[PDB]
Amino acid sequence: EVAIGIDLGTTYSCVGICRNGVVDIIANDQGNRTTPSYVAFTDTERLIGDAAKNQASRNPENTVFDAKRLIGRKFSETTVQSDMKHWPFTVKGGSDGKPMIEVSYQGEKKTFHPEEISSMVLKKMKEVAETYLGKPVKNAVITVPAYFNDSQRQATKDAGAIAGLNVLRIINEPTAAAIAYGLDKKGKGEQNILIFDLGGGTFDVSLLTLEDGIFEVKATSGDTHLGGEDFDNKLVNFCVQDFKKKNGGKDVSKNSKSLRRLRTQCEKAKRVLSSSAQATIEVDSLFDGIDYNVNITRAKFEELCMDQFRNTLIPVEKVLKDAKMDKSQVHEIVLVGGSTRIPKIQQLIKDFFNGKEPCKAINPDEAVAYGAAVQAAILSGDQSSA
Ligand SMILES: Nc1ncnc2c1ncn2[C@@H]1O[C@H](COP(=O)(O)OP(N)(=O)O)[C@@H](O)[C@H]1O
Ligand SMILES: [Cl-]
Ligand SMILES: [Cl-]
């Protein structure tokens, strides 16, 4: 009976349920409405979500994340060779050509396929819904990026099966976001929908057409390496240089633990800057027992990220060009992904679309799970959302 919608995200995952036409996004044990797509292995336990992300800087080698960049891929693909520089954990190729993530768990060397790591994230999201409902959950709709190939979709479905879920369907993330806003029901006639999805690691723009309750992905573009983590890195690079000017050329970047601790505080300041004009980045005993403190204005953050923010419009122009349509022909602009909370990004998109207000009523990092939950309820025979 009970079916959930799961956004299996690169950096964060989210679980929703649609009952009586109402969608509840379910909070985890820590009260978080999204859960990090992190899995860590220690001498005693296997941590998933918040607990895994929280100990990442203390256990870099055995804390896995970014499995979505490896799922359904051959280890030899150029994408894997390029991305692996960003991972403190070890990834090797198996005799079947599949990636094998190598960690230490309880003093033993263990290997996992990307779909096994993703199955642990999915199992945690299943448990988050189960704790809320007080009942077991078997059915689910899981989302994937529109550009995911058959191998990536099938490996994501397999991750669901391993997690104990009966995957009703694998659907596209941009389509799930459009379904969340009821754009398939609302009004009538052909509608051109632009989904602007800027998450923690990726940027995806998708141009959809909707005629008679049927969504079609006309064109997609973006950048698989542009997200919130790149804006955090702009703050990290600035702080590293600021520390040098304050402490006679001392270089924080030589210590990877100092960088990780600084990155944690840079991301917190970035979030504050979405609703405040200023924020403080503070790390006690950052490097060589030296305390670090700096005040960052929203203007300074905007300046450090200026080119990256403006360049988000390039894939918007590209999808419009590929779909052979003018920006004036876009009926709805849906903001998806946690980074769309950045005021400058919202302003740039609004100005590009000549003052058109983007649809952002749903928490952008929840809209995909919200749409997947609606689709899960429809596929279970519940027509109340319509
Ligand atoms: N209030 C906020 N302002 C700026 N950035 C924010 C934010 N709230 C969340 N974010 C960013 O959103 C990113 C995560 O986005 P989300 O949509 O949940 O994850 P995902 N797996 O789709 O990448 C992180 O980089 C985080 O810093
Ligand atoms: Cl249901
Ligand atoms: Cl309930």
Numbering used by the authors: 33 to 418
Show sentences the authors wrote.
We noted that all residues forming this pocket are conserved between PfHsp70-x and the main human erythrocytic chaperones Hsp70 (HSPA1A and HSPA1B) and Hsc70 (HSPA8); however, residue Thr111, which is located within 5 Å of the bound fragment, is substituted by valine in the human proteins. Thus, although a challenging proposition for ligand design, exploitation of the Thr111 side-chain hydroxyl group may offer an avenue towards increasing binding specificity to the parasite chaperone. To model this effect, we refined the fractional occupancies of the PYZ iodine and pyrazole moieties separately, resulting in iodine occupancy values that were lower by 66% and 33% (in chains A and B, respectively) compared with the pyrazole group. We noted that although crystallization of the PfHsp70-x ATPase domain was performed in the presence of a non­hydrolysable ATP analogue, AMP-PNP, the resulting crystals trapped a hydrolysed nucleotide plus the leaving phosphate group in complex with the chaperone.
